[PDB]
Design an enzyme around this catalytic site. Structure first.
Site, PDB file in Angstrom:
ATOM      1  N   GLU A 140      -5.740   2.691  -8.362  1.00  4.73           N
ATOM      2  CA  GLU A 140      -5.834   2.930  -9.803  1.00  4.73           C
ATOM      3  C   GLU A 140      -4.697   2.226 -10.517  1.00  4.73           C
ATOM      4  O   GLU A 140      -3.566   2.338 -10.104  1.00  4.73           O
ATOM      5  CB  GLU A 140      -5.754   4.439 -10.145  1.00  4.73           C
ATOM      6  CG  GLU A 140      -6.158   4.821 -11.565  1.00  4.73           C
ATOM      7  CD  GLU A 140      -5.955   6.334 -11.826  1.00  4.73           C
ATOM      8  OE1 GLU A 140      -6.578   7.183 -11.138  1.00  4.73           O
ATOM      9  OE2 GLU A 140      -5.146   6.662 -12.698  1.00  4.73           O
ATOM     10  N   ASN A 143       1.224  -7.104  -6.114  1.00  2.00           N
ATOM     11  CA  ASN A 143       0.609  -6.324  -5.060  1.00  2.00           C
ATOM     12  C   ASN A 143       0.194  -7.220  -3.903  1.00  2.00           C
ATOM     13  O   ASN A 143       0.514  -6.924  -2.754  1.00  2.00           O
ATOM     14  CB  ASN A 143      -0.590  -5.566  -5.598  1.00  2.00           C
ATOM     15  CG  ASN A 143      -0.193  -4.246  -6.251  1.00  2.00           C
ATOM     16  OD1 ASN A 143      -0.625  -3.207  -5.814  1.00  2.00           O
ATOM     17  ND2 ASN A 143       0.654  -4.292  -7.278  1.00  2.00           N
TER      18      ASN A 143
END
Ligand SMILES: *[C@@H]1O[C@H](CO)[C@@H](O)[C@H](O)[C@H]1NC(C)=O
Ligand SMILES: *[C@@H]1O[C@H](CO)[C@@H](O)[C@H](O)[C@H]1NC(C)=O
Ligand SMILES: *[C@@H]1O[C@H](CO)[C@@H](O)[C@H](O)[C@H]1NC(C)=O
Ligand SMILES: *[C@@H]1O[C@H](CO)[C@@H](O)[C@H](O)[C@H]1NC(C)=O
Lengths: 497, 497, 497, 497
Positions: free
Chosen positions: A340, A370
């Site tokens: 999320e 990420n």
């Protein structure tokens, strides 16, 4: 293929306006001829995943920035990209006329859109719901005799999910997460606020909760949907806070460890759904590496955990090495997955800022960071919201890549949508992140991956105002001579073949 | 038979707590001999429709306010009282266990409750729905071959209406009202916002919209439900405001006039449902008398119109006399009916205030004023809501006389419920308002009616903090010496021979 | 001594009520012989810095957690504790009658209060101001001939500072920090938003900005106030955020480095205020060690930098060890100071919760962690605020240890006030943190310091609900047997010879 | 002139963008030559008070709409147009750079702008303040020894008022209104909530409150500002309401009558400020004619009242003849004045909708209605707000004609600004409304007035989508042949000479 219809709402960039008869779309994907590269470009000035092609050259001289592919330094394989079918998202989408609904769903899921292959599904209600409900609201129903899916699932979420999968070429992977249990399973007897499961792992309350996950999977399977994974709990740290305003269920890492080892693991393993994976944490990365150690250094919990799910609130600053980097170091065989992300907090400005280039840049920057720290997937929050950033029963409004204007039967694709698409469209499941070394320090964010077929993908984001000349070197093929304009994002594709 | 179980939530008064095994209720109605009266009393301090009896005496011992019944001055006959079976109300009621559901329905519809005899039924979705839908959302279906009732009607609304009628001793009148048409009949192709029917009265769209009414009545008749009346459109003036957020269909008074004259009237008349009445307006009283003059001055419209439906929401903008009184004077043979008897929430208060005596008083005050200005009946809005004022797919603004806690299998009867019942319980269909003369200026709100059988009913509301000594004179019987306590409402009943 | 007069406002603990004629206070400090200890205790249940004494004896009768003083393990020396004299604080204090003003100032700055010895002073306006202004708003005044102090300084802040210093026995250190420059020195020509100084370090704009600091110090010196230190800019990272709502001036770490090297450092050195110290950063700790590396690895900047100022606000985003610990390791001769020792209301809570024990615990917990990671001092944010958390010209978001009710000539001392005082009252400037070894894992937060005269201070915070039995061993004196009650904070003091 | 710089924010029309160096403006006003007319036009399509001229023709034939001037049917004389210098307005304006502040104040007050000649000034704090204060916050200061003006007056409001008057060529009238008294003058002891003055008219609380008005006037006179008028109380009905969220002071009409008769009237009369006029009511027109009757049918109150002040909230629609017309009929010699108007409200759209043509139309429609029913002036609410519609300490945000974006040092002139200016610029004090008959029913709003010098002004607003051909007949001169484009507003000016 149809181009963006731009509309300004007075922010830094434009939205692309879609309606029942028009939405911007791509032609079917084709690989660039050997010796050439494809470039997709989006810019604050208004370009939206615009395609061009150039030559791969044999030689390069000069002292400009050079990014060199390192195809033999291989990292993680990609699970995929998607967003959340919340109650809010499904209500906004279904409030559009049917042809507009399909153009929305095509935008996200088709090869003629951005090729999403993950959908996150709340187990019952969350803050992006218009009412609180669980699947088993009859007090003390420990056998779950009255477990059932309400209309929010049978009439909104489920039919949209079927439609998304029908539009997708790629297999789509479904991920489920609960916010709260039935209130009669909870110490505080309320959907929100501070409270955890009553009793102790092993007991009737913890067993009933684990069987609730199974009943959920059973009910979705009755509707011909199967899940790739579940999380142990959305944001377990939230239920530890006094006055937490919306649906939550508290777990310390120890409680999570013991629930998984005693209850959730064995129960899922003993069910027809034993192939569904389990992700732990499903919370802010600031809780790592501590939460991972607590859970994964217990072999009785560890054996049941496939991966570690992380959230980030993009209005806040990182840093990833100490959290993501250290967790990978300790547990390299337990995938990290971003379950999320959202923007808007934030405080001096709106929940929805139609056309914000800065919010788009936050998405792609987060995605690159990420991918640079082992994360195998990235999942947006609400697929669609209204112009207020809702509905949200607690008014905890936030932004979304697609904003639905029901009164106009139209939807706006935000810069966030394109910033996401620069990754989701071009990095299929199976793709593996590889090395990419800069010849000199620079302001660019860049990541390289190789497709399952061998071909290369590079995304380059320029969050600075200055154009940056650059060369990408691939020793298999040569040099790509390009420019990264200020406030742009590019994806580059070529065969290595 | 069973007393109120009080609970306070920090507001000025208490709610009555009901659950699966307990709810406050009344003994079957039983009334005393000539010379005795029955009094039902509710108070802010906590009394809830408490019964006592006393004498009507030949001598007058009071020296304060006298209210004299004048049975010879006869005004309007009463159609009755009820509330709306919205999707929200049905969802809330059905979230209780069956025994609790039954106590809730008995509270409203039984003689052991408050004797509602009217239910308003939305034709498809409104704001108090969890999604947008109509009965014919498949486009271009101009003969409505694809008209059908969804689960909201067949699973939720219809069964509960059946159960309501089974519980009622009095016959119940059903009133239907549409919010929006299929969006393919609308200028704007949306459920909400600024938009009217396409084309003009008499054309294919207008005839299709009119046929939808008959289709609705056919569908309900298959479920063995018949309607007393339909309104021409819920709040037609809302569909004229740009961006209106709820389901709507705009009509100027002239468009309503012509749609009625050209399409709706003829179609209804040509159907087997020709006995179903037609009410116009269904909107705020500020629009009167204008709207009434536009429509009812046209014989080709007026032959099809039985009454004028009003809403209370914006009553504060326009006084009863200039609106209700003036409309009656100009069209004394066209009945006035309050079809959404739900009045306006202060901008800084929550939607639901459990135990608000003020909101209860606002209901009774507004019923009295309506009765004093020729109004024949009342439908409250949602029969039940959750503690958030929901579910509502747009935003909760309104309270409801019963509030359901779906986590505790319990429901709460608000002061509003009892202020409504002080009228609904004691004023059967066919009662006639008669004169009641105050001997001097005073601050009480009072009204007298005569039952069909000739017996008297008088309601006295004290919105002040101060006790008011009171005498009531029936010229046929004598003097009832009483006190209206501060913050009280009383209903007196007595035989006149 | 006068005891706390408690009042509840529905939160977990009480405030202490003060007014024109009454406020809680302490006796002159008086401490016992070798072998005796003093204990000050505050509890959620309502105790407020209550004093008791007991024995340190030779025999160890506890069998639980043992904390052993290790006076030979010596860490940082303390600069001190205080808070900020914002416009808002000064407006709030000055709205009291003079006798109430004096009791509030004594509460903070006398030995009969909590002994603050630091005041932070904004240079011109910040969010906690009722208007935007700087000291040189007349454009193109590059020699700053029009530099002047407005009434906020000359009528409000300065006389209050004088009165503070007159009340304090301990010497008080003043720390100044600017939020914005005159907008004509700025790229964006606004007090807020994304914008920095025009030009480049060394130019007329940068030189004028440096000169502004000196002009400030001159102005205050004309009012007989001298400064201990200035920070290079309040939250430099805020002025890099597009639309930042509060007064700000953006600096990247390199720009701060260069402004210090090229302009601020040399200008301060060339002035009569060359002894005033310069602190860098004055921002969130998540920015460390990076910011410190950029600035402090440049000898031309580092020669001018005395310490690094941090804010606590976003502490949750970055652990102490990785930020404060690592910065210390890399730059062990550059002191760490918390210049805005404030948080930070959970997104769903009011700015001010009168009597929140939780918010008190957050201050004490964060002081303890800071002390354990080398931090030498603290300034809280606003010394006082009104009950809305104001006045703030943008938005109220933070609480304050003293809340003034300007309608009742009263002020309320929050649990935060007492959690601060448990440190500020008993840790004079020059105290040195020393070792304090826990015998086993535990949940208390504890820190030991030695006073300049060699006497011991230990603060023990218990954030849990459970009483913890405790022994404290001083190798020179013996064993102090005690209990840390749940939800308590204790300060222990004793002579060591 | 400089023309509008249009910017769209996605609503129905554009705003005009102003900054430190650019703002749209008019040439000095000049009379149209005899035999010709001037026309100023604004349209949703983007024209902003664009000037043209055409011929006055000797005759006209063809039966389109004709508006005939009736110059011998004379009604009210106009006092003026303007808006409110609230704390919020002033803080926003003064946060712009000095040259931009001057362009903003020129826009409103200069002949090269829209010629405002009224400014409403709150007496101390209201909802559009960032803190609550009154001028006499020392409890029980009946002598008002601690009465003083805070910085909100001496540093923001008062300097801006002086600059406004300097820019204006027409004399400007100042109007003062209080929201709350000191809390110690009130039964509830709080600035908001249900509560009126303690005691009874005639007594010390009521005398102190009257003397407060005189101290306010004295303090403003010290700053060389004089007032045209005061109101008795802003929105007296609001303090009668339990839980009213912001500053108020409740008065029943009887209480207002008696306060004026016993206290305020005599106290002002006996002061040096006896020429200052007094307006009663200052509240919603729905309270008329009742409030007027109560006050004005008592000669001891009547002798002190110069006029009746009315408010409207433009998102609602009351009727006007029943309220304004009836009050004029009863009290033809007591002027009616509109002292506050605002829009949005409209929960479902924002407080500020940058570029809303609909909200501009609400303004002009309201002003025409008011002028058609005897009203002598119309005063907007906040002169300027930020993009959120604040600051507002209670978050009661609303729209404003000028929206300040501090971060960009810019301000946006909304359609409301132009709709207001179509009146304020062209209808000087002294202008008298005259008759204007339509030859046929039409959808236009129109009003005719004559300037003091005898020349004519006609405003025509078209709220429909249809162009309307139009002739205006003036028997003194002939016919003006024109067209009213859909969604336009025109002002026509001509000498009759
Ligand atoms: C949908 O968008 C297209 C492309 O802008 C436009 O031309 C068409 O008119 C739109 N349809 C609408 C507004 O119904
Ligand atoms: C239902 O209410 C009755 C009356 O208060 C009570 O005695 C009973 O315990 C309630 N039921 C439950 C399960 O709480
Ligand atoms: C000030 O507080 C003291 C201590 O509670 C109290 O005795 C006194 O009455 C207070 N003063 C006022 C005016 O309330
Ligand atoms: C002010 O406005 C005009 C836009 O018309 C523009 O030319 C000028 O650049 C603007 N100035 C600033 C500082 O933005």
């Amino acid at each position: 293929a149809r181009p963006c219809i731009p509309k300004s709402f007075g922010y830094s960039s434009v939205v692309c306006v879609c309606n029942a008869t028009y939405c911007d779309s791509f032609d079917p994907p084709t690989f660039p001829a050997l010796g050439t590269f494809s470039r997709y470009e989006s810019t604050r000035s208004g370009r939206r995943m615009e395609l061009s092609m150039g030559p791969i050259q044999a030689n390069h001289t000069g002292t400009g920035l050079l990014l060199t592919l390192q195809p033999e330094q291989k990292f993680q394989k990609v699970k995929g990209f998607g967003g959340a079918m919340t109650d809010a998202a499904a209500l906004n989408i279904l409030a559009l006329s049917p042809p507009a609904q399909n153009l929305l769903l095509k935008s996200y899921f088709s090869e003629e859109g951005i090729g999403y292959n993950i959908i996150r599904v709340p187990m019952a209600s969350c803050d992006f719901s218009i009412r609180t409900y669980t699947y088993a609201d009859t007090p003390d129903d420990f056998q779950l005799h009255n477990f059932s899916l309400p209309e929010e699932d049978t009439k909104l979420k489920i039919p949209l999910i079927h439609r998304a999968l029908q539009l997708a070429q790629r297999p789509v992977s479904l991920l489920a997460s609960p916010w709260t249990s039935p209130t009669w399973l909870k110490t505080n007897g309320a959907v929100n606020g501070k409270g955890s499961l009553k009793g102790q792992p092993g007991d009737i309350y913890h067993q009933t909760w684990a069987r609730y996950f199974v009943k959920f999977l059973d009910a979705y399977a009755e509707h011909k949907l199967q899940f790739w994974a579940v999380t142990a709990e959305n944001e377990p740290s939230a239920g530890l806070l006094s006055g937490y305003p919306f649906q939550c269920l508290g777990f310390t890492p120890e409680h999570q460890r013991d629930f998984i080892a005693r209850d959730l693991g064995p129960t899922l393993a003993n069910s027809t759904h034993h192939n569904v994976r389990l992700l732990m944490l499903d919370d802010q990365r600031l809780l790592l590496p501590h939460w991972a150690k607590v859970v994964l250094t217990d072999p009785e919990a560890a054996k049941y955990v496939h991966g570690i799910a992380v959230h980030w609130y993009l209005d806040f600053l990182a840093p990833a090495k100490a959290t993501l980097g250290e967790t990978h170091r300790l547990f390299p065989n337990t995938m990290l997955f971003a379950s999320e992300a959202c923007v808007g907090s934030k405080f001096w400005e709106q929940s929805v800022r139609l056309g914000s280039w800065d919010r788009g840049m936050q998405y792609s920057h987060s995605i690159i960071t990420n991918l640079l720290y082992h994360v195998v997937g990235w999942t947006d929050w609400n697929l669609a919201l209204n112009p207020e950033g809702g509905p949200n029963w607690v008014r905890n409004f936030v932004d979304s890549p697609i904003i639905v204007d029901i009164t106009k039967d139209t939807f706006y694709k935000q810069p966030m949508f394109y910033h996401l698409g620069h990754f989701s469209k071009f990095i299929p499941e199976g793709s593996q992140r590889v090395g990419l070394v800069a010849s000199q320090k620079n302001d660019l964010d860049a990541v390289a991956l190789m497709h399952p077929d061998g071909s290369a993908v590079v995304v380059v984001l320029n969050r600075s105002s200055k154009d940056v000349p650059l060369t990408i070197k691939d020793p298999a093929v040569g040099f790509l001579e390009t420019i990264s304009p200020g406030y742009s994002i590019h994806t580059y594709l070529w065969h290595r073949q």
